[PDB]
C-alpha cells in the first residue's frame, strides 16, 4: 500500500535546520526498507512557521521543517512507523494517508499530483521510456 | 384539464332539446354543424419519423443483423439493458427538428461577427413566391446575407460540384467577399460623386453620434455635480 507521510520536524539548532529532518528521514526509510518496504519518494518541503505555537511534550514550537515521504509498505509496519513518530520528540506533527493504487500502479505525491504530474514517470519525464 | 365532452356535442344536446319539445325553433347553426361534424377524437398520436433529418424512430437492430464484430471487437450475442426498455415516450414526444444549416450559420456569424450588425427582417413577405436558382449568390427579391452563403454551400454540395462541406463553404465565402467588396465600393464612390456634384448633407453618422453623446453627457454632468455635492456632506 502506498502511504504519504507528512512530518513536521522541530528545528532546535539554528545553524543547521536540516540535520534533524535528515536523521528522521534516515530512521523512517531504514524501517520501511528493512520491513519489506519501498521508499518511492522523499520531497523536501521547506522551513515554515507553524500556524500556532504548537506544543509537544513540554517544548513549545513556533516553526518547523516540513517534509514528505511517499512509501509503499504494509499496514502493520505503517502503524509501527506512526507509533514511532508519535512518541518521538523530534516529530511535532505527523500524518499518514493512503494513496490508492487500484487503477494505476505508480502515483506521485499529493504535491506533484496537485501541480498536474499524476505519476512519477511524468515527474522524471518521458524519453526512451517506450522500451 | 379533462377532455371536455360538452363543447363538441352541442348538436346532440340541441337535437334532444328540439325532439323533446323543450326548444321549438331549430338554431341557425344546427344544419351547418350537422353538415360539418366536429372532430371528436383527442388522441396522442405516435410519431415514427423525424421530418427535419429523416431519422427513423422506433427501430431496434436485432442480434442477427450483426454477423460481424463492432468497433471494440465484440460480437453482439444478447440484447443489452438499453435495448430491453420500452420506448413509447420516444414515439409520443414531439421530435426535435435539426438542420445542417444551423451549424454553418453558427460558424458564419462566428467568423464574421460584424455581419450580425447588418439588420435583418423576419417578416416573411411570401415564402411560396420564392423562385431562386442558386448557381449564383445574388437573388432578386432577396438581400445579400450569410444565409445566401449557406444556401450556396448546400447547392454546391447537392450538385456535387465540391465534395466536402468545408470546400463549398469556402467557395461561397469568397463569392460573398467579392460581392460585398463591390457593394462597399459602390457606396463609397456614390458618396464621393454626390460631394463632387454639389450635394449638401445636413448631418452625418459621426455628428449624429456626437450629438447623442452630448445630450447624454450633459445629463451626466448635472447628475455627477449634484451627486458629488450630495456625497461630500
Amino acid at each position: 500500500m502506498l502511504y504519504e507521510l507528512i512530518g513536521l520536524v522541530r528545528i532546535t539548532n539554528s545553524n543547521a535546520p536540516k540535520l534533524e529532518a535528515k536523521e528522521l528521514s534516515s530512521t523512517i526509510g531504514k524501517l520501511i526498507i528493512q520491513n519489506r518496504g519501498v521508499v518511492r519518494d522523499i520531497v523536501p518541503m521547506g522551513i515554515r512557521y507553524l500556524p500556532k505555537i504548537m506544543k509537544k511534550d513540554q517544548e513549545k514550537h513556533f516553526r518547523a521543517y516540513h517534509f514528505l515521504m511517499l512509501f509503499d509498505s504494509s499496514a502493520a509496519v505503517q502503524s509501527e512507523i506512526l507509533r514511532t513518530l508519535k512518541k518521538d520528540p523530534r516529530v511535532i506533527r505527523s500524518s499518514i494517508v493512503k494513496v490508492d493504487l487500484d487503477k494505476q500502479l505508480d502515483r506521485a505525491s499529493s504535491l506533484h499530483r496537485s501541480l498536474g504530474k499524476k505519476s512519477i514517470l511524468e515527474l522524471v519525464n518521458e524519453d526512451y521510456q517506450s522500451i | 384539464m379533462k377532455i371536455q365532452t360538452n363543447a363538441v356535442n352541442v348538436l346532440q344536446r340541441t337535437s334532444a332539446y328540439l325532439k323533446s319539445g323543450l326548444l321549438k325553433e331549430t338554431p341557425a347553426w344546427y344544419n351547418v354543424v350537422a353538415s360539418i361534424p366536429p372532430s371528436t377524437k383527442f388522441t396522442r398520436e405516435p410519431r415514427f419519423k423525424n421530418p427535419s433529418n429523416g431519422h427513423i424512430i422506433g427501430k431496434l437492430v436485432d442480434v442477427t443483423e450483426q454477423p460481424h464484430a463492432n468497433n471494440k471487437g465484440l460480437y453482439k450475442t444478447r440484447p443489452n439493458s438499453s435495448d430491453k426498455r420500452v420506448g413509447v415516450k420516444r414515439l409520443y414526444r414531439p421530435p426535435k427538428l435539426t438542420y445542417v444549416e444551423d451549424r454553418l450559420r453558427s460558424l458564419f456569424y462566428k467568423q464574421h461577427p460584424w455581419e450580425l450588425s447588418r439588420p435583418k427582417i423576419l417578416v416573411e413577405n411570401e415564402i411560396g413566391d420564392e423562385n431562386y436558382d442558386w448557381s449564383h449568390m445574388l437573388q432578386i427579391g432577396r438581400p445579400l446575407d450569410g444565409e445566401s452563403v449557406i444556401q450556396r454551400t448546400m447547392y454546391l454540395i447537392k450538385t456535387k460540384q465540391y465534395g466536402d462541406m468545408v470546400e463549398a463553404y469556402d467557395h461561397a465565402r469568397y463569392e460573398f467577399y467579392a460581392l460585398r467588396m463591390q457593394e462597399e465600393t459602390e457606396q463609397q464612390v456614390a458618396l464621393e460623386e454626390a460631394e463632387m456634384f454639389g450635394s449638401l448633407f445636413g448631418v452625418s453618422a459621426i455628428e449624429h453620434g456626437i450629438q447623442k453623446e452630448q445630450e447624454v453627457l450633459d445629463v451626466w454632468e448635472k447628475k455627477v455635480v449634484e451627486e458629488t455635492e450630495l456625497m461630500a456632506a
Partner: protein, 155 residues
C-alpha cells in the same frame, strides 16, 4: 399463461384509454397474443402489430430465442364519439382465486344468474374463457361445450 401478466395488461390498457394514446405495447406471448386477437375480433382494438421494444416491426422478423426478450405486440386503441371503445378491462379469475366453470354454469352466468359471485354477463360486454390453452369468448366456449377457466371482462 401468467394471470399476473394478463392483469398487468388489463391495467395498462385501462391507463392507455384514460390518457387516450393511439398505440400501446404489451408483452409478446401466446396468451397475450390470443387475448389481444379476441379483443380485436370483437372490435375493441383497431390493429395488431408485431414489433420490438422500440416500435412496430418495419420488416417481418422471425421470432427466435435470441430476440424473444425484446419482442412486443403493439395494439391500436379505438376512441369513437369522444369515448374510448375499450373503457374497462378486468379479471374474473384472479391468481389468488381462480374460477373454472363447467359449461352449464357458464350458460347460467350468461343468462343473468350470478355464479360464484361473478356478475352476470352484461349486454355490450365480453367475457373470455380459456379452454385447453385456447382463449375464446364465453359464447363460443358454450357452443363448443367446453368447461373452462373464466378469465376477464371487457365492456
Amino acid at each position: 399463461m401468467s394471470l399476473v401478466k394478463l392483469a398487468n395488461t388489463c391495467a395498462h390498457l385501462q391507463n392507455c384509454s384514460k390518457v387516450r394514446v393511439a398505440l400501446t405495447s404489451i408483452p409478446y406471448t401466446k396468451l397475450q397474443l390470443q387475448f389481444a386477437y379476441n379483443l380485436y375480433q370483437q372490435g375493441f382494438l383497431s390493429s395488431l402489430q408485431k414489433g420490438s421494444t422500440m416500435g412496430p416491426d418495419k420488416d417481418f422478423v422471425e421470432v427466435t430465442p435470441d430476440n424473444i426478450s425484446t419482442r412486443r405486440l403493439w395494439v391500436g386503441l379505438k376512441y369513437r364519439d369522444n369515448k374510448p371503445v375499450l373503457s374497462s378491462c378486468k379479471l374474473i379469475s384472479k391468481p389468488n382465486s381462480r374460477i373454472h366453470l363447467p359449461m352449464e354454469d357458464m350458460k347460467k352466468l350468461c343468462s343473468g344468474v350470478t355464479i360464484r359471485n361473478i356478475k352476470p354477463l352484461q349486454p355490450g360486454e365480453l367475457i373470455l374463457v380459456r379452454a385447453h390453452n385456447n382463449i375464446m369468448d364465453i359464447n363460443e366456449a358454450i357452443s363448443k361445450k367446453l368447461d373452462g377457466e373464466v378469465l376477464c371482462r371487457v365492456k
